[model samples]
Structures are given as C-alpha cells and as structure tokens.
Target: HTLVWGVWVNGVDQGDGRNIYIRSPPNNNPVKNLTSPDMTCNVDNRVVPKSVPVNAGDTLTFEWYHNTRDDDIIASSHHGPIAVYIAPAASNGQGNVWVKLFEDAYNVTNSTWAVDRLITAHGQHSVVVPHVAPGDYLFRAEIIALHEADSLYSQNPIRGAQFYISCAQITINSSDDSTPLPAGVPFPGAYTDSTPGIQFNIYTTPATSYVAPPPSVWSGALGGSIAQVGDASLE
Candidate 1:
C-alpha cells in the first residue's frame, strides 16, 4: 500500500498530514472496506497543526510513495481512477461535508487509467482549486485500485478495491470572492461494496466505461467557473 509523502499547493510544499498512529503491521496500508472509518481519511488522518493558505483557484498536487519519495510510485498492477474532494476543516473529515472537486477515471478512447497517468507523473495527482467560501478546509486525495476488486470484501476479506487516501489542511483565501460552497456526501456511506465502480475487476473484465462514485464535481451555478478539473502535468 502506498501513502502520501507530501502535498504541494501552488508549487509550495505544504508538508504531510497523511497518517496518524494507528494499529497495524503495515502502518501505511490501503483501506479495503468502504464502510470503515479509515475511508474518511486513510488511517485516521491527524489534524495538521497549521493550515497552509491558498487562493480560490490555486493548484494542488498530492505526492504519494510506497516508502520514500524516490521509491516506486505504486505497483503498476494497481489500476483505477482518482478522485479529489474538499470539505470544511471543522468537519474533521467525517459525515457528509465532502464535495467532489476533481476526478480522472479510465479514458476509453486512449485506454488509459488515471492511476497510470499518476505513475507517469511520478505519483503527483494535481487539480485546480474550486471556488468555495474562504476558510480552512480539508483536501482529500483518493485513488481507487481495482486490481484485486473482483470480489466483495465479505466474500474475500483481502480481495476488494484498495483505496489510497490522504487529507491535507489548508485555508482557502478567496479574497473578495465568497463563492457559495456546495453540499457533500458521506465518505463511508457514499460508497458500498455493491457499487459498480467499487466491485469492478480490471484484469478479466473489459470495461468500456467507468462510473465515478456519486456527488460528481461541483459544476453548479453556485460555485465559481471551473475550466478544468485535473492537471496531470504537475509533479
């Protein structure tokens, strides 16, 4: 299982707040159960003592690694999509306060998965910051690996979608822009084992398309203009 090494906001290093002291033989393992509390923020994310400040439309890049920054980004066999969400830091990464801001799943035309693009970028998943009420927020970076998701967790404890997740604390400074924030869905409750995307098999099954989990990117009338959701070039 891989984990976030650091989070860079607008080319500035924001430090790490990925993992807290949790029971484990492998402390940085992926979250297998969607209903588990760990799904909120992998391994129960620790509150970042201080929040990095950023504007409404800044770029955020999440860097992940198996052990170190120089190590393998992640196993090539682990293939799936990546989704990023933002929530009020006051929520503590719980409940239904999260709103999807970016998602890059499988590309049918090119036959490419977001995970491949992420590896190509050396494990840096980047996204444009969406407009929201200026204040402290938690940016949740998530990757869903379907390499071993052919079966449900009940059928095989270890055989299920692997979720690599992390959260970063940041203060959004919209300046004069007070874009109304959008509503969100619960992390654990939003996804289930029966969900098509969660139970998919990337190896044997041929997928012409993918269904990204609910609460799609907030392209509503309330928020600010979003020209693009993902920026794969950043590292």
Candidate 2:
C-alpha cells in the first residue's frame, strides 16, 4: 500500500500536487512477481507526456506514502530497503541497461533500515544524481518490503515480498561524460526468488543480517560505492 507520490529536484517540489512521469496506479498495491515485466515499473503504468529536467549533479527526492503525502508513511511491519536505478529512455525501460544510482538496504549498527529512515524523514528519500551523459533516462525508484518474504515466491505467491516501484522519465541537462556509464543490469533479471535479500526472515530471527540483491552499484570510474548496499550494515 505504498507508492511514490511526488518528485523533487534540489530540494524543490516538482510534481506539485500531481504525478509527473512517475508510473503509478489508481491503487497503492505493490507488485509481487520478481520475474514479471511489472518489476520494471508497476502494474498499469503508462508513458507520461513529458520528462523532468535535472542537472547532472542535482539531488532528486522521492516522496512515498501509504495513501496521502501526510498519511502514515507505511505500516510498521512493512520494512525493507529502497533503491533507485536509471536506464536509457530509448530502451523503454527494458533490457539490461539499468545502472543503480542509489540503494540503502539496512543499517544493522543502529538497528535501522532504509524504510525506517523514510518514515523518520516524513516519507521522503533523496539521492544525489551521478554525472552521466546527457539524454532522456527512465528513472526507476523501488522499495522492497520483506515483511512476508520469509516464504519463497515460487512456493507462495500470495505471501511473497512486496515490490513497490515507479519510473519517472527525466532528461539530464549537461554532462562532460567524466564518469562513463557502467554495464547495467536488467530489471527482471536483477533479482530472483532465491536471492538472499528476496527471501529473508525479518521476524523470529534473533541475529539477522541482510544481503541486498545486486549487479553491484555502478561505481563507474570513481570506483567508489554509491550507497550502503553491500556493507556490514546491509550485510
């Protein structure tokens, strides 16, 4: 019952009171098929008319909520990681061209998770835009709720992990191509039911650690990590 309700650039609200290019549904239900095409975006998502304009190094924020902007961010039980990826618009958000821009799986030290932070921030999640070539891109925002993920998706379709996702069309203004884009991963192929992060027990496990699904974060030329995806906190 969680979905992105707004988009922001550099601390400024851009979607106003409406959704821009963010692929959304009339309902806030989440997608459950890990191998389905809906993993790329969500059910009944459509192409919007325009793309949001952003600078190469701008900061983008996604506002998520259970129903309305000021409503409860999400249920206390629905906790997991959040990630963002980008693909060329020409791909129509298909294929293996998606490079991860941001991801925060968990923070074991503080006994916190990305969803915890989202709720603390009033349902807002932000990521710094990486420097890339200028062009239209399908910005994909995702939240994986593992409340019922202790069961394998193949075994129990009704109680699998919940995948809340939306794609926003965006155009980068200017870039010198200093950090060449890395080989990205496909949406459906990026995760499987057997993936540790996909199938985990958030309840009843005394000592719990998590490993996020990955093609690995796109370090590009900087060779630096993007988010706390594979660190001890997210382990």
Candidate 3:
C-alpha cells in the first residue's frame, strides 16, 4: 500500500484564530504537523504520503486547534470545524473538486457554516468519518466563521485562511475479502500547479516526462518553443 498526500494554504500565516493538524487513521494521532511556529504560512501544493495499507473501516481524522487565554479556549465569533471532501479518481486527479464528506455544520449556534464541535482549553478536538474506500482521493480542512455578527473580525475572508489541506493520492491493496486487487496495483498519478488565472501547458513523452515550460520567455504570444513555454499567464 502506498499513500501520497498534498497540502496548501491561502494566507501569510496560519491565521489568527485557527490552526490545522493532520493525523493518521486508526489511532488518529498526529503524523504530520503542518501548522506551527505561531504565525508562518504555506501555499506549496504537492502530494506526500500518509501511511501504507490503509483499508476500509480505517479513519483519517483532521483536528482543529484553538487559541486559549486564562485557562479558557477563546471562542472566535465565527469558528467552524474543518471540512473534508472525498472524490473518485479522474483524469484531473483525486479530489480535484469539492464533494462534501464530513462537515460539523450541526454542532454550533449562530451560523451553521461556522460552527464546530466545542473544545476545552488545552484540549484537542477532532471529527471522524467511517468507511472510506481505497483509491485516489482528496481531503481538505477549512475553518469557517461562526456568527454573522463576527464576520467583520473573522479571519475567514482571507484567501486560503480556512486551512485548505489535502492528502496525497493513496492506493489501498486490500485482501480481507474475496474481491481481487485491481490491475497495475498502485498506478502513480501526476500533479501540477499553475499560477492562478493562467493557462499553462505541459508536455510528456516516453523518454521525457511531463515538463512545464519556463516562466515567461515565450517565443510567441500564443505559441512558443516546446521547451520555452511563456511566462505564467492565461493568454
């Protein structure tokens, strides 16, 4: 079993009110700590592994960490628990688009979109969804504003402020049942990131894998050298 995961952020820092954490299934313990050091931010998008041999009935848990003051966890005006999505494998990639898997919309007051399961000071909180199949998939964690009144002070408006996290593509080879494993076993999927609002092209061959043209340095406005694709732009 091979697990590949990816993660990205939309802001300059982890944001003022929320923090994101990734954990492995079964035990739900922290395997990778993505958010730490108080105020740093991240936006790199690439897949990495989570674990090998994850099967059905296994659970991947995303937890939210809230700031505390005076032995009490300060409640933000609009604090929603992280959201998770799982989609079938497609040409674009796994979980390329959002399809709701788990949302803590029913546990808070104010706005349903901004609420998450409450936690105590210095306490860890998490939400778990059961019965995930083995295949290429995506998982994201986002923080939302809780009440309409707090929208002004809420950090949800900042781009990528909601903690948009993703897991690497995972291949589960299960032998607990009668069904035979799929052919090719763990097929590797490729991923690429383009500048927002840009039209980037990639080329690949049997000898040369997918290679993106260099940024800028285009031979023509519409076309360019096979190796000199223009800067990162849509047109």
RMSD of each: 4.5, 5.9, 19.8
After aligning candidate 3 to the native by TM-score, how far in Å is the CA of 117 from where it should be?
2.2
Whose TM-score is higher: candidate 2's or candidate 3's? Answer: 2
Best by TM-score: 2
lDDT at 120, model 1 = 71
Q: Pick by lDDT: which candidate is best?
A: 2
Q: Which ten residues in a row have the lowest lDDT in candidate 3?
A: 223-232
Q: lDDT score of model 1?
A: 0.71
Clashes of each: 0, 1, 14
Q: Hey, what RMSD does candidate 3 come out at?
A: 19.8
Candidate 3 whole-model C-alpha lDDT, 0 to 1: 0.27
TM values, all candidates: 0.85, 0.89, 0.37
lDDT for each candidate structure: 0.71, 0.74, 0.27
List, residue by residue over 1-235, the lDDT tens digit for candidate 1: 6777666676676655444211112355788877888888776456645666777667777777777663667888888888888889888878878888787777788687888777777677676666677888887878888888888776799688888877777787764455576678888788886666988767667756667667678773222211223332444
Q: List residue ranges in candidate 1 displaced over 4 A.
A: 15-26, 220-235
The per-residue C-alpha lDDT of model 3 at residue 46 equals 38
Q: What is the lDDT of residue 25 in candidate 1?
A: 22
